[PDB]
């Protein structure tokens, strides 16, 4: 009967809040012999230890579930791995209270760890809602190469290819990139100015410097920002009008205490309705067997619904992250966040406070701006492209057709020694043929300019294998 439920905080007043919520749980819809005794542990000064209270004090008191905060500083590298995985020997479910590190969302290694606060990769889905409100097709993605970052990349690419929307670039980083300027000059090459960001704080702040440095901060350069970069100095070097995110009820953890105790209490009263309730092991000695009701814990927690939470409906994803937690979209304006976006989880509510787009006006910009400059490479095929040399001037001659008509000629940059493993020298060479006539017809009827090159390979190029004997690539 007696269910011991743990809590990892830094304080003990909110542990007493857990105790009073346990009293509420004994009062509310859950009754009555004796089924609960109180266990609640603060953070430890030695981050090596982290399991002394767990085995000696919690598992010895048979704790079924622990509710864990970040750290006693909550901002170092002490995001809570060790209590979770030392509970994860025998597949014991743990609810991270306010964690947003989506490393923990990885089910493959983090086995039984579910959250009341969803991480930023779920927020990736939120940006797709921006798509359907603001009609985009050309996308700039910027990812510091993280397991969080690559998992968010997976969610982004799935939700793109489900609606067949196609991003342009995903440039990749480490946490610590400062010579972003090469990748910034690559970023100057697009129709798109839609900037989606996922990195650390100082990464962001230096980028808000270098890109502003490029200039690259004009109207259209819209900064789509994860909330880690809405902290620290990423705040302090960003321009204004930037669309950022806020999860509603992310910090008031007393509401999380009330909601979590109600959820876990009625989850226990769902557990007690089942059969073959295995006994929780006291010792972390001699107990050489994983939980059997571990997956039954999971079937309780995934299938239980809690519409009556303080944060809204406490009902989860297929990640154990809450569905339809309320979202808001904010705008630094004179570096002061301004409410625009509101979501239940999906329902678009733009506030009457207008979006000054983070350069110029409130006009919805376009990541669509053509250049009318068409990079063409031309295959060495006569009569389609007669590839002859130019003059000594580097210029084409004055010749004629059989009809006495002056030939449409193209200076074409291309190699001299057009063979692999040769000194290839990009020389202007005259080009003649069908397609030049076609392109100048399209220049007249279509108003484009054309950037014509020769093939270094002299070939079309097929899918062939690069070394390791599996890399099928178009050549």
């Amino acid at each position: 009967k007696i269910v011991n439920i743990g809590a990892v905080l830094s304080t003990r007043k909110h542990e007493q809040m857990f105790r009073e919520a346990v009293n509420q749980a004994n009062k509310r819809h859950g009754s009555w012999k004796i089924q609960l005794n109180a266990t609640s542990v603060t953070h430890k000064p030695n981050a090596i230890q982290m399991a002394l209270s767990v085995c000696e004090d919690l598992i010895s008191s048979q704790v079924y579930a622990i509710l864990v905060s970040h750290p006693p500083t909550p901002n170092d590298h002490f995001t809570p791995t060790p209590v979770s995985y030392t509970a994860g020997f025998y597949r014991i479910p743990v609810l991270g209270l306010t964690t947003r590190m989506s490393i923990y969302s990885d089910k493959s290694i983090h086995l039984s760890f579910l959250r009341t606060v969803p991480p930023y990769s779920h927020q990736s889905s939120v940006w797709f809602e921006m798509m359907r409100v603001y009609s985009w097709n050309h996308i700039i993605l910027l990812v510091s190469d993280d397991h969080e970052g690559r998992a968010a990349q997976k969610r982004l690419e799935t939700l793109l290819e489900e609606r067949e929307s196609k991003a342009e670039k995903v440039l990749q980083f480490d946490p610590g990139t400062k010579n972003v300027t090469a990748l910034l000059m690559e970023a100057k090459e697009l129709e798109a100015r839609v900037i989606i960001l996922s990195a650390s704080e100082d990464d962001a702040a230096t980028v808000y410097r270098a890109a502003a440095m490029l200039n690259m901060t004009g109207s259209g350069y819209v900064w789509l920002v994860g909330e880690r970069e809405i902290s620290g100095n990423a705040l302090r070097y960003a321009p204004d009008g930037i669309l950022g995110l806020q999860l509603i009820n992310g910090k008031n953890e007393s509401a999380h205490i009330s909601d979590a105790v109600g959820v876990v209490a009625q989850a226990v009263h769902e557990l007690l309705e089942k059969e073959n309730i295995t006994d929780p092991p006291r010792g972390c000695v001699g107990n050489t067997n994983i939980w059997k009701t571990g997956p039954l814990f999971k079937r309780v927690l995934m299938s239980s619904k809690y519409a009556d939470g303080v944060t809204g409906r406490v009902e989860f994803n297929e990640d154990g992250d809450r569905k339809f937690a309320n979202y808001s979209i904010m705008n630094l304006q004179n570096r002061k966040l301004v409410q625009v976006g509101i979501y239940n989880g999906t329902h678009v509510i733009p506030n009457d406070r207008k979006i000054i787009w983070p350069g110029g006006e409130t006009e919805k910009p376009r990541g669509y701006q053509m250049s009318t400059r068409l990079k063409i490479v031309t295959i060495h095929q006569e009569p389609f492209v007669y590839v002859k040399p130019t003059l000594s001037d580097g210029t084409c001659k004055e010749e004629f057709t059989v009809n006495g008509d002056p030939v449409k000629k193209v200076i074409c940059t291309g190699p001299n020694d057009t063979s692999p493993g040769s000194p290839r020298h990009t020389v202007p060479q005259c080009c003649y043929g069908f397609c030049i006539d076609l392109l100048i017809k399209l220049a007249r009827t279509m108003n484009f300019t054309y950037e014509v090159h020769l093939v270094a390979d002299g070939k079309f190029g097929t899918q062939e294998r690069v070394n390791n004997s599996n890399k099928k690539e178009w050549n």
Binding site: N46, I48, C55, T86, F89, K107, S108, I109, N287, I290
Partner: protein
């Protein structure tokens, strides 16, 4: 200098001390005074981890770690993270739960394990599908954490293949104890070879269901890796013949052989330390304090575990700590349901097998009489025999492999059954009969005689294989003679012939 060892209760401790003494007197005679502390346990228990680990970290800061248990819990190797990150001491996982690789090795992890390397699992499973030409699949996994990885492996490594593997989709059983939805999803299996990626108890459940589904017939085949086999010492009941696993078991090895191998790996890493440094970053002192930081200023073994060679065997490791030249003991269950040596992968990761195609051999019987021994002559253009083409597989568009008896010498006439590619009229006709009469046809070639010879009426060739029932069926370009119709019955004529005369 110091190596700690925790084991399952197994071959004993003084035995391991003698193994350490023999490794010390063997080779690479160690300016570092290597000292090893070993124990035998049976626990999956973290207080045992705290006691043993913290008391050995208090004692002289032990620098090496070897773990071969008699366990099966996969998350133990995942719980070695806090040893790899709260001691920063390199870890070796040979047997037990330390063998069970599901921990994708972190930059804070110091893991090197003799366990079942996952990418190499996928490639070796596909080469098993290569080497007996089982192109037709059926794929059944579950949604244990880390199987979507294997789904990605199968999809990419088939799509990176020009072989063109016949794909039946990955049938993921959602949850356990469904028992009606599982049978709906497992009646969707409509091919021969069934590839399972599950647990052990779910494999009990799936075999109990598929013995009712008729999918455990013994022309079907069952290649199920070390996720289900694990301990070959444990042979449960419902697991029939022809179950094929890939595991780093001590059939080809012992405990102490792998002990001496892994200690040698650590000593070549320590010799590369003594090359590139002259000092060693010591292990931590206690589990109960953090004095300055975790600054690894003296650069532990992760560049030093890159290059390891021993005794003609490259015991080096990849970037994710997996074996560059792996062992990969491929083990097939038989009639007696015994875990026996079949395949090896130590020579350039190439297969080393018994050439035994049939392995499902009436364990939980399911008798089937459909195999037609058809042994004919090389008769152009009815039968045209090519050799094995190196076209990234052994699969040519019009061929069947036909096992010749290639004799070794004149004194040793042992006809090695060499599979060779086969085409012609009659093989197209047998394809038509596999499309109309729809059975299986066993193609071989005639060596003794050609058609039939009354050697005191002891028939040779085709008729010798028919009468003595070597070739139960025989097609050939066989002239239906009256003398042959006395001896052998014949079908309809299907090609008109007779005797003609060729001249200029």
């Amino acid at each position: 200098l110091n190596i700690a060892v925790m084991l399952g209760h197994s071959h004993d401790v003084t035995e391991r001390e003698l193994r350490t003494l023999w490794g010390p007197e063997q080779a690479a005679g160690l300016p570092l005074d290597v000292n090893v502390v070993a124990l035998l346990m049976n626990r999956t228990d973290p207080k045992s981890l705290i006691t043993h680990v913290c008391d050995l970290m208090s004692g002289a800061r032990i620098h090496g770690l070897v773990f071969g248990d008699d366990t099966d819990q996969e998350a133990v190797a995942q719980m070695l993270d806090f040893i790899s990150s709260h001691t920063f001491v390199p870890i070796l996982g040979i047997h037990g739960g330390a063998s069970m690789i599901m921990a994708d090795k972190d930059p804070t992890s110091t893991f090197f394990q003799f366990g079942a390397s996952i990418q190499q699992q996928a490639t070796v499973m596909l080469k098993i599908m290569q080497d007996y030409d089982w192109h037709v699949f059926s794929l059944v996994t579950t949604i244990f954490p880390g199987y979507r990885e294997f789904i990605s492996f199968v999809k990419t490594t088939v799509d990176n293949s020009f072989v063109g593997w016949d794909m039946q989709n990955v049938i993921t059983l959602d949850t356990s104890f469904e028992d009606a939805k599982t049978q709906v999803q497992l009646k969707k299996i409509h091919s021969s070879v069934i590839l399972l990626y599950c647990s052990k108890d779910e494999a009990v459940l799936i075999l109990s269901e598929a013995r009712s589904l008729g999918l455990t017939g013994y022309d079907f085949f069952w290649i199920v890796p070390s996720l289900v086999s694990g301990n070959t010492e444990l042979i449960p009941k419902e697991f029939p013949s022809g179950l094929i696993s890939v595991s780093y078991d001590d059939w080809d090895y012992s405990l102490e052989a792998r002990v001496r191998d892994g200690i040698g790996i650590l000593t070549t890493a320590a010799s590369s330390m003594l090359e590139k440094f002259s000092y060693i970053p010591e292990a931590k002192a206690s589990c109960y304090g953090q004095m300055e930081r975790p600054e690894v200023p003296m650069h532990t073994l992760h560049p030093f575990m890159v290059n390891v060679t021993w005794d003609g065997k490259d015991l080096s490791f990849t970037e994710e700590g997996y074996q560059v030249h792996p062992r990969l003991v491929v083990i097939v269950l038989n009639k007696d349901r015994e875990w026996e040596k079949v395949g090896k992968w130590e020579n350039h990761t190439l297969s080393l097998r018994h050439a035994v195609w049939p392995r499902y051999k009436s364990f939980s019987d399911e008798p089937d009489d459909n195999h037609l021994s058809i042994v004919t002559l090389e008769e152009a253009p009815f039968v045209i025999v090519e050799d094995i083409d190196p076209l990234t597989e052994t699969c040519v568009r019009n061929t069947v492999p036909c096992r010749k008896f290639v004799k070794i010498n004149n004194s040793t006439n042992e006809g090695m059954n060499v599979k060779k590619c086969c085409k012609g009229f009659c093989i197209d006709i047998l394809k038509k009969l596999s499309r109309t009469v729809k059975f299986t046809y066993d193609l071989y070639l005639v060596t003794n005689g050609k058609h039939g010879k009354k050697v005191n009426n002891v028939w040779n060739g085709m008729i010798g294989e028919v009468v003595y029932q070597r070739a139960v069926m025989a097609v050939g370009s066989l002239t239906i003679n009256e003398e042959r119709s006395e001896v052998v019955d014949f079908s309809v004529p299907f090609v008109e012939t007779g005797i003609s005369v060729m001249v200029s």
